[PDB]
Structure formats: C-alpha cells, structure tokens
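re: ur msg from earlier - yeah i can do the N23 complex, just paste it... oh wait u already did. ok heres what im feeding in:
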Amino acid sequence: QAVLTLYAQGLLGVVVDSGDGVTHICPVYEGFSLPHLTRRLDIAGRDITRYLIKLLLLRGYAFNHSADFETVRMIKEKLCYVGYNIEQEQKLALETTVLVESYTLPDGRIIKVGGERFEAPEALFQPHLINVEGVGVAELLFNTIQAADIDTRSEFYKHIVLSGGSTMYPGLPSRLERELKQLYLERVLKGDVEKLSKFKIRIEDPPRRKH
Amino acid sequence: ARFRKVDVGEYDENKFVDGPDEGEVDSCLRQGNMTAALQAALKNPPINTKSQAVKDRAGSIVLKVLISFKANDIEKAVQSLDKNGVDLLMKYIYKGFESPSDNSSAVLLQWHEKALAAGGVGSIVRVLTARKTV
Amino acid sequence: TATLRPYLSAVRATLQAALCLENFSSQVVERHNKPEVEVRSSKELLLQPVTISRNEKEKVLIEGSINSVRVSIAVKQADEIEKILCHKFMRFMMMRAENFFILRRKPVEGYDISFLITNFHTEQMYKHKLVDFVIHFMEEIDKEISEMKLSVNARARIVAEEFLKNF
Amino acid sequence: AGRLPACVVDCGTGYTKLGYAGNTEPQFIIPSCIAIKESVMKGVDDLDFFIGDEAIEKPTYATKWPIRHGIVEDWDLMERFMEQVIFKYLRAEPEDHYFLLTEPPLNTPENREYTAEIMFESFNVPGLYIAVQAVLALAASWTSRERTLTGTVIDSGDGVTHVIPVAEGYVIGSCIKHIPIAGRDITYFIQQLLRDREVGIPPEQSLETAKAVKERYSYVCPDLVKEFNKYDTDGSKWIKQYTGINAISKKFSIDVGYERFLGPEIFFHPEFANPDFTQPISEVVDEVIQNCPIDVRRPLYKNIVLSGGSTMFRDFGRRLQRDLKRTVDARLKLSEELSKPKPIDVQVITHHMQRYAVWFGGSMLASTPEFYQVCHTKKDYEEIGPSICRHNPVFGV
Amino acid sequence: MILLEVNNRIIEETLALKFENAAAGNKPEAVEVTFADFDGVLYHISNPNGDKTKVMVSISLKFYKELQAHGADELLKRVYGSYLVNPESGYNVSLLYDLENLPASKDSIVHQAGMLKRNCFASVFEKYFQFQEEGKEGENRAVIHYRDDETMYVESKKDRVTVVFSTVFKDDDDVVIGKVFMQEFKEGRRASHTAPQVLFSHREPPLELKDTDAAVGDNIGYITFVLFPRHTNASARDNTINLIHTFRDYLHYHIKCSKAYIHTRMRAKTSDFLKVLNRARP
Amino acid sequence: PAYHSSLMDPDTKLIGNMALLPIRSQFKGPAPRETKDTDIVDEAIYYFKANVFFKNYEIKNEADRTLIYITLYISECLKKLQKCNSKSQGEKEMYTLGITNFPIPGEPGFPLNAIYAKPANKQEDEVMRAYLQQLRQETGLRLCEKVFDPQNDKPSKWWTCFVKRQFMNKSLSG
Amino acid sequence: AYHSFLVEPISCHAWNKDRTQIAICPNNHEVHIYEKSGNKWVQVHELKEHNGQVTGIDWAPDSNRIVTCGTDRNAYVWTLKGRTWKPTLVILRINRAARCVRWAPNEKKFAVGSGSRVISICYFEQENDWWVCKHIKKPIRSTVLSLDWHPNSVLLAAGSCDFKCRIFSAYIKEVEERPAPTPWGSKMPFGELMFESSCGWVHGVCFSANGSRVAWVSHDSTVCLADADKKMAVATLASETLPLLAVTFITESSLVAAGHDCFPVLFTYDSAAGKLSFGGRLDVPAGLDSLHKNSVSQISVLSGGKAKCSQFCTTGMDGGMSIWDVRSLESALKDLKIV
Ligand SMILES: Cc1[nH]c2ccccc2c1CCNC(=O)c1cccs1
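and the outut:
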C-alpha cells in the first residue's frame, strides 16, 4: 500500500500510515519500499480510544472499556485533535472554557469534554503516557530518514504523506512539522538556529484520500 | 527527551514583522494659556522611537497639560483640535490611564467623555488599531 | 459617586470598540481555530492593550484581537472583609465558568476576575447586550459585596447578643 | 489511623444515615428533610430550621426534601442540613475528622465539585472521600463470604429499585436499569387490599396501618395458589390480627391476611399494581447482566447483592434466585436443543447488614488505613482546586 | 439552632434504648459504640467483659490530668456517685449502668450521662468561682489545653473571675470573619449591661501572659470573658458554666454557618447573572 | 406468571377454539362425563384467587380459553353471591344467574372476541351455548360450598373482597 | 427590504445572473440555494461536500457555475446537471483554511485567498481535463481577507491581515492574452505587484467599474481610494464609528459600505480635490434602530453594475439578507448625494 499511496499523489517519498491496528512509516525511493529503514509505531486508533476512556474515567464518568468502547470511539472521531504546542493547549484548558464541548450519549445523558480532546491523541507523541516504549511517530519518522541515505534526505523531508484513519486528527500535519524541525535543529545542527529557515519540510495532508 | 523546549516558530520565515517641546509647553502653562499648551504637546509625537523613555516623556508632558485643566474648560479645548488631533489626544488619554494618581484619573475620565463626543467611538478604535503608538 | 458614571462610560465605550470580532481560522495550525488573544501566536492579529482606570485601585484591562477579547477587572476592596468576600465571590463564579461561558477560569495576573468573549459568543449573542452585561456585572458585584458585608455584621451582632443575654 | 474516627454520612432520597467509621450500625437514621420558615432573609433567620423527624410536623414550619431521585436539587437546603448533621447530631468539630460521603451512580462531576465546595469552603474538612453507593453495598456483603468488587446490586430503598452492575469497583453506567417498584408501592397495594375487605380503619390512618402491616407481617411466598390455599385451610394459624388507636376518639381491630404475601409479591408481578410496568424483577436483572460484556456476565450472576430496607422481606433473595435460575436455565435449554453451554451459577447474596448496607460499607472502609491515603486533603484542594474531587479511586480489595 | 447544645445525643439516645428494653423485660442486646465530641473528645459505650446486662459509658480527654488537678475526680464523684467506676483503659472516666439495677426515674441519670463532658470541665470553674466568692486572691491561674494548639486560662480576682481563650483560625480568611464577630462581643454591653464584658486581642496574648510561653501569630486570637459575682454565684453557676465552656465552639460554628449563608447569596446572584446573560441570546 | 390448565388432551374435543373439557356434573349439556378426581371447574376455582390479579394471560392451548371463561364467570357469581343471606338462597341466585343468557364469542359485549373463535354455524352455536350454560351451572353450585362458612348467612369476606377486581381487566357483564 | 434566513450568521452569499437565486452558507459546512416564489423564499438546493466551514461563494453569471472554498482547505467548482449540483475538487495546494473566492469577469479563472498567506489563481485545462493553479506569494505576509478582479480579468486587488491592500496581475497567458495597458501599469507578468497601499486589517477591497479606481476598508475605521489616473494617489477618510467589513462602488465616484455598525453608508469621491467625504446613513428608521441586528459582512451590486447601480444586497452575522433600492433611498433622503 505505501507504494500505491505515493502513487496516487503522483510521486515515486515517505508514507506515514495509521489505522486502528498499527502505524507504519514506509519510506519509498523512486520506485518502491525498503524494509531496512521501514519501521512500525505500535500505537494506533484503538490505543487512543483506550486512553480517551482512562481520561474520562478520571473526569468522573462511569465508562467501561468493553461496554462503551464504540461510544468513546465516536467521541474521539468527533472531538479529538492533535495539540500543536502542548504547553499552550494545557493553558487554554486550565484557564478558559473554549475547549469544552457537550456530547450527547446514546441514552441521551450529556457529558462535557475539554482538555481530554488533545491529551488522548498526544499518546502518539509521548507513548509513555500509555506505557509503550518508543519515541513517538515524530521522533520515529526523523530517525527513519536521518538514518537513511544522505542523497534523499532533502527529498524525503519535503515529501511526507499521511495516510489512514488515525491520521486525520486536526493539526496533525502541523505538529509533525514542528517536531521534525525541533529534532533537526538540535540533533543535526547543534542548535544553530540560523542555518535553519533553509531546512525544507512539507508534510502534506491530501483530501482525495478516501480512495 | 528535550527539543520541544525550543520555540522553532520564532525563526519561521513566513511570520510577520512591523517628542514635543518641553519648554514650549511650560511656556504656555505658566502663562495660563491652556488651549495653546494642549495644541503644542500634541505636536510631533514620538510615534517612531524605540525607547519607552522618550515616549514616557511625551506622555508626561501631555499628561501635565490635561491635569492642569479646569473642568469646565476641557470641552472648548477639545473642539479646537482637528480630527487627527482628536485621535492623537485619545491615544494619550489612554496612556494616562496607566499612571493613576491623585485624582489624575478622575479628570482624565472627563477628557475621555469630551474626546469621545468629538472623535466618536471610531477614534478609540484607532487607539486599539495603532501599530506605532505613543 | 462622582467618579462612577464617568468610569463606566469610558469602559462601555472601549468595550464597544473591542467587540468587533469575526471568525478566524488558524494561520499557524492546520484546521485549528483558536482565540488569538489567548495563544498570541500571530502578532499582526493582536490589538493594542488598553486600560481604563477610575483611581489607583479600580481599573479595567481590555485586550483585543481579530476573533476575541479578554476583559479583566480590578474590583473595589475597601477593607479586609471586602477583600475576602470579593475573593470568595470571584472563585465562586470561576468554579462555575462552564455555565458562565464568557468567564475565564482564572484571572489575568493583577485582577480579580476576567472574561474571554469570542466571535462564537458575538455570533449567538447581541454584542451590544454583552457589552451591557459587562457593565451590569461591574455595578452589581459591588452591590452584592456591600450586602454581604452588611449581612455578616447583622448576624454577628445577633450572635453576640444571643450568647450574652443568656448569662 | 488517627485518635478520632472519620464521619460517615450517607444521604438518601428518603433517609440519611450518619455516624462514625468503625461502628456497625449508624448512630442516627433520619428523614432526609428540613423544615424552614416561609411566608428576604435577614439576621439569623437562615439558622431557624429543623431536620429529620423534628422537621416533619413543625407547626409554623414548611417541610422540604432537598434530594430528589438521589440527586441534590437545592444546595442551599443541603448545605444547612449538613450544618446540623455535623453540629447537632454527630457533634464533630468538622476540622478534625475526615468525611466519607456517598453518591448515587450517574452523579455528575459538577455535583461532586459542589459537594466539595460545601465541605472544604464551609466546614473546612481536612479530607473528603466520595464513594458510590453501589460499590459500598458490594463491600458490605463481604460480611458473609473470595471477595470481589464485581457483581450486581439490587438497591430498593423506598422510592425506586435499581439494578446496578459493577465490575472491579467500577459501575457499568450504560447498563443500569430502574424499576417503578419499591417499598412505597408495596404499602399502597396493601392499602387497597385492606380497603376492599377490612372495616373500621380510620380513613385518615390508612397508611399508618398498611405501613404497619407491611413492616410487621409481610413476606415473600414461593407460590401464590399454594399460599392462598394454606390461608383458606388453616386460617387460624395464618390470619393475624392488628389493633390500632383511632386518633379521634382514642377508640379498632382488623384481620390481616392475604396482603402478608401479596404485597411483596408485586416485585415479581408488577402488573398486579402497576399498569405501566409489568417486568418481573428476576427478568430486569437478567436483561441488565445480558446487556453487559459477555466476559463479565458469569461473575455478575455469581454475585447478586441485596441492599435496602425493601430487600428485607423474608425470602426475598430466595425467590429472586429461584426465578432468575429458571429464566436463565430455560435459555440454555433452548440452545442445546437448537444445536452444551456450561450451566450458569446464579447466587443472590443476603447478609446481616443489608438494611444499611451502603452505610456499613462506608463505615468499614473509613476505618481502614488505606482510606486515609485515598482521600483528597484540604492541601490538595487548595493547591489543585475542587476538580480533584471529580474522581475518587475505588479501594478495599 | 443558635446556641450549641450541651448534652451528647448519642450517649442519651443509646442509654434510653437500653433502659427502655430493660424495663420492658426483653433480653439485652449487645452494644459497641465509638464516637467523638468537640475538642478531640473520644467516647466509648460497651458491655464490660461481654456482659450484655451492663452498659459502660467512657470518655477520653487528652487534657484530663489538668482538669484532675482542679477538683475533677471529686466533682465527678458527687454527681455520679455509685455510677462512677474505675476508668476503662484508654479513657479517663467511666460510668457503669446495671440494666438489672436501674433507678425509679431512669430519665434523671440519662440526662447526667449525656453531660459527662460538661461535668469534667465543671470543677475548674466551680473552683475559681469559689475563690472569688471567698476573697482568696493571688491564687495561681488554671491552664487547660483543651486542644493541641489552643489554651484556656482561668483566674480569679477581688471582684471578678476571668476566662481567657487562645484560639486558632486555621483558615486565613476565617480570621477576618472572626474579628467581625469579636467586635460585636466587645460591644455586647450595649444590649445587656449586666452580662459579661468581653475583650479581644488579635495576634498577641493579653499582657499578663506576654511573659509566659503563650502563643503569638497571624492566626491566633485571644478572647477574654469577665464573669461577675452575679454569674459566678451559686445560683447562676451551672448555666454560666454551660455557656462559657461552649464558647470556643460557639464562635467557630457561627463563622462556618456565616460562610454557608454567604454561599446562598452567591448562588442567587450567580443564578441571576446567568439569567441576564442568557437573555442576550436571540 | 399466570396459572394455566393442564387438562388438554391429544384427544380432547373442541367447540369453536375452546376445549370441550369433561366435567363431573348432573346438569345437562354436551360436556363429556369426567371419570377422574378433578375437572376444569375445580382447577379454575382452585386458581381464581391468584389468577384474578393478573392483567395479562397468555393462551397456551384451548383449555385456557375454557379456564379463562370460567374464571371471568366466578367473578360474576361473586357479584351476586355478595348480596345474599344464606347458603340456601345463594344456591338459587346461582341457578338463575347460570340460566340467564350471557354474551358468547362473536357477539358485542363478549370481551376477548379477538381471541375466541366464533360459532361457524347455528349448531355449533347452540352446542356452545349449551356447554357454557352447563359450565356456568356446575361452577355456581360448586362455588356456594366454598363461599359460605358453616355459619349460615356468611358470604365469607375472603371471597367477597375480590368482587371488585377484574381478571385481565375484562368482564362478562361488559 | 429585510429577510431572515436563519438566526445564525450567513457566512457568505452569491447571486446568480438574473438575481433569481441566492446561495448562502449558514455558519455551516453546507451551501443553501434559495429561490423566490411569489413573495416567499424557498430552499431549492443543498450543496454538501465541504468537510469544513464554507467561507466564500462566487457564482459565475454566464457559465452558471458556483465556486466554493472552505476552512477544510478545499475549493469546489459546482456544475448544474439537470436538477442537481455536482462538485468538482480543485487542489489549491495550501495548508491553511481558504478564506475567500471570486470568479474573474471572463469566467476563465478564479482566485482563492487563504491563511497560507498566498493567493491561488485557478484555471481549467482542456488538455489534461482538470483544474490547476499558480500561486501569488510575494509580498503577502498574512491571511488574505478579500478579493476583487479588475474588469480586464488580469489585475487583482487583494486585502489581507498584514494591513496592506494590493493589486497584482493574475495574467495567465494560456486562457487569455496580452492585457492591454492600464493606468496601473504596462508590465503585467504573472504575480507582478502593481500597487501596494501604505494600521488595520483590510476586510474589503473593490475596483470601480472601469478599473482606474480601487477602494478598500480597514479595521481602523477608515475607507480608502487610490486613483490610478492621479499617479495612484490615495484618499483617506477616518470614520467616527466602528470598522466597515465590506465595500463596493455604485458609480465611478460613489461607494457604499457596511460593517460592525450594522447599517450601510455612502461615500463620495471628489476627483478634483482628491478627497473622500461622508454621505451618511442609508438605513434610517434586541434594541437596535438598524434593519440588520448584527454586523454586516458582505455587500454586492444586484443590478446596474458598479457604474450606475440601482439595487444592492447585504448579508450579515444576524442571518438576514437585505435588498436596498438606490432611487428609494434618494427619495427618502432629500439630502442624499451620490457622485
Ligand atoms: C450513563 C451512561 N450512558 C451511556 C451510554 C453510552 C455509553 C456510556 C454511557 C454511560 C456511562 C458514562 N456516563 C456517565 O457517567 C454519565 C452520564 C451522564 C451523567 S453521568
């Protein structure tokens, strides 16, 4: 699939794909994929839906990981999104109410959801928040490339493409870029914040996606 | 796992990037010529200087003319200014509000009342919209 | 009150100028929509902060932006009893900030209470009525604090008398 | 561990149980009502009220009931009600005792914040824990058993009966079901049964007698016809007598019969007294456990715990278990035939602390050292806010 | 309720239910109860050695030794006489009621049992009132630490007996409300010229104790009552004792009910603000 | 649930969709002759007190329709037997009552017309009217030896109290 | 003449050629088309495709095609097939919300302003049979708020949050040819910056009927006009009221605008003195004395073109759409001017 996804966008780059079961970073060079350099992020859709439950049981709501799984999943798909700057998001959640939304449940009783909206998807960037050793797609992608050939780096970085159900969270492309930049700056240019600016990353979120 | 500590956006090339004669005022103030002092303090505002020092100065002079006014003598003075003057006055009145003092604020609320009737709410808007201000 | 009406009038006027908001999609984050005056991630979108003061204690800070306004108020507090009644009363409303959708959960540092009015609010509420609520709010909390003060004293006296008259 | 025991207060829609942790029975069991003056409060008029029994007949006072359907509908009145619970009955200096309060399942986080506001901002309690009734009830049954916090709770107070499934200390909210049958309905029924037969019963003392008869001679029978038969054959050793005093004239006797077993019978045959509800309680329980996760149904069936004064009738559980096993075994009979599912073990637990199961659980938990590590302290309240009381970690197993 | 009641309801109700059952002829049920009272007082009602025919009521006061050095045991004995027995381990005073040997009027002893706590304090006051009434001056002052960080000082003089209280206001804002009430006590004479004069010091003790290790601090508060012969005499004594030993709790209780009341004002006000806000909607 | 009859036989005859159940009576009618110690009229009386409280009754076989009819009629007997002063007088009212023509299936005034099959012809019609009259008679005289206590003029209150309750909220007098 | 389509905002609107139908976005992901039947409005079409809030609508009069853009970053050209509107995706190549869209007069292209701080000039290619677009980037530094084509379908005026009002050249030589010179300039290669004004986000921009005059309103409560015939000199006028959000020409020297005051106003340009002047309210009689009960966010000329306009439409955040008559206004206000 990673091959085809690059096909549709009319290219022959890297493909970040995540569904319910798992996440895959498949870099593709002028033709096909290369197992070496191709990794897997062991956290996807489900794991976020599970976290959204621990977060809501923490709020004071009687959810059951099995009886209500499908219900919380729909809450995730409708309300969750990826924080850009977690420090700025926690402030919005702590100091104001602009994140609080109401969600009517199947039987009709209402519940309010706020900070949880971004905290759950955050698992993708801090696996430790749900007990999973890894460094999160952000850091992972950056190692699947930086570690690769030096003759494709620049090409790859300006050719990343999202794919799958767990990649439509609002703001994901933006967070990915901020992370990659942050990694580049320190881990590859020793914090020399001037040679930057000319670092080129273009993580595209295509609309045609469905098919 | 440090690296999220650096605010990368601060180096994003797509971002955005943007007094009067103290003696002349004193001269009219000592002579009791109030309307004149006002019109002099509202001249050549430090609209382009970087130091808050030169600006705080211009503000002081202007503020020293407003406080030095008699309640029933403000309406007249306001109406002697042109729209640009009214807009500039309004910017200073709002500056004065940041330095309350022995009734300094009680009279400034008089200048505001008068200035607004002349410049309309529009002048206040131009206080909120100014990128280069006093 | 010789300084009250003039104060509320300058506040009402500034509030009318700040509540000219419109919906604004994020320029910094894909498919996000945020109250700019809060995240402040795009300087051109912010307006010049202004303050209207009645005296050295009472004032109002008004911070605008293309899509939202933050209004902070410094409440009149004469003596110790008023200071604590005001503080309990502000926390009381803040804990209920969700029902009171224009209130911040915490004040801007240096003030007793803060509002955060967004374009979404001005789209479902007449802005001239919100401006009226902020003025109505300032007048009314002063009265409520005065009444609380009188109530405590009233009950204090009866409590000190009920005990003493029994000896 | 401390020199003083914690205060345990269980507020119900009808009655409030209060006392100190470590004891077995509550120290006071009073009507969840408060009487005030009504006909702009000033001075100390707010303190002019009474609660519990003292509040039911007060001449110049109006009786209010702060809690409806288990949820606080008047915080002003609830806050005062606590004032006397603490200062008049318990006589506890609130700053010295940790408090354990209860709440029905499905209570909102907002309400917990309101409760905490009252306990920390008003009475300045050093620590507060809010437990869910259902879970405490489960814990209460341990007094007669491997102990688990998984099971189905049948709470029948006086307003309504609830079938609450619980898994590992956590209520499966989406699966609760309520039943329009409880102590009150039983009384009313026994009232109709008397009106149609007994005479000389003071019209203004209709309830007094029925409630008395119910509480003194009622019970659950195994079979309706066989029971009716017993009463018509050996009438002398089944028909009981009741004698009351006419409040007007101080002068009456009535035979008590069929109603002894017919009243409680309505739990099993709701169509008897209720035109809108006809599901037998055995069926409601079955439905609930079936709606839950397949992998927790057997544990639920294996631990059905009773709770409330209305599950106190002699043989209540025996009849619930028998009927429940019939509906369940029948379903498994159809399966085999259609096609060997291992039989399902159905237990309906009954114990000595049932009537105030919830309070006893609360009391036993507040006596353990673990309860002090799990309470939200004042310090945490002040440094994190009321939002800390939104989640009370379940403990005890 | 404005004045805190003096008797203990759990003691009274528990006894009555056992006394009524004993009179009826029923077989005695066992009893095991642990409860408290204001000022860290701990109680215990139980059947000594499992004997369901006997009911013991025991009280524990961290500061008993101090009241003991002031006529405590003696006053107690005069009051309970044959009901007082050797104190249960963990407690200071124990009352033993024999269900098989109850007085004709069981109501009279049930009332005294409920006052166990009040009677333990009684002496320290009865003693110093006795001093005043006899002229004996110079007598050292009594120092009762009724709480871990709170103290009461009783001292007699030529024409008056004084009771001082060192009380702590854990909550910082509680001090402010406290003053409002204290000021109204300071002016109580403007309503009852005969009643006790009341003084009040915030942060520091009254000079007489500035040499002693008395406490000082932002949350401490001293209150001085000045009882006169018309209160201390043997005709008012009890009632005076009943009021004065509940004062500390009387004060803190009203400070709390005061906040409860402010809360209802806030609920009403907030509720109104929400109604206006919602009328701004089309 | 409700109490049903256990008399339906793979050889039991039907009149309409009711069951022509045997009975041990002398009265005339097409009711077979019962050999056994219990017939559908005892069963119905044995159960009445309990069944009468039910609001819903599931018809499992055709005998239930017979049980049901007898049950609804017992309530009828109690309507009368309620106001009488003797175990002899009551015997008479029960006779008259039983001979009086009550509504049958198909006619307006017979509850449950949606459950009881209507007589397909004049014979089936006269036969059924007969079977019901015979059931009504045995049922009445049999009910007097129960309702009355060895102390004459005593329509036991333990039979009169049900006079106001209606099985399935239906009536033969309506 | 006021009408209320809903109680929430009408994000944006667009009328067809004959002013027989109006397409509005009700603070929704959808576009609603209403047609009049007698003296009632009736919903006739529901365009559901955008996954985000629609922010701009434009109806191409002759080809009868509707173009929409939304916060979901997409643009959709809508074609009428019998009795249904079918949407065709257009990749704008942006990563922030689109904010505005306008067909060129020749209906050969259309521009989309967005948060990406760029303008997407889109045109169809009968070659590969799909929509493509070039970008105009420099010197735009912020979100593009408004747009307006020049009658020559080449020059494009734009206003954005970087406080500037600019005129560019959307010259695409593969759908049109060498634009004839204009007072704005001679050299018009793609993306050339023809003009740039010299405080306040620019909510609206408008080109006069002949194109030698461009006007725009900003957040600092001012209205401006740059005369191409007078070396692009700029006339400025400070209002004493709240910020205007929309503006159009009604004659070569008359402008109508509206905004946060909730009522339209008239402005006039004295060519000789190079000075703008206040012509006064046009809406002369909740607790408001204006027809709209909330901010007016868009205004369009219904008939008479920008040369001799007779009727114009307004829509606002109150959910209402007003149709104003110029002769009726000239009558009710004996003191009204116009040019
Ligand atoms: C109560 C309830 N109904 C549901 C329907 C579908 C999925 C979950 C649920 C739940 C459990 C979570 N809800 C709550 O805890 C509360 C809802 C409203 C007030 S509390």
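cool cool. The longest strand of chain D covers residues 161-167. ping me if u need the other ligands too
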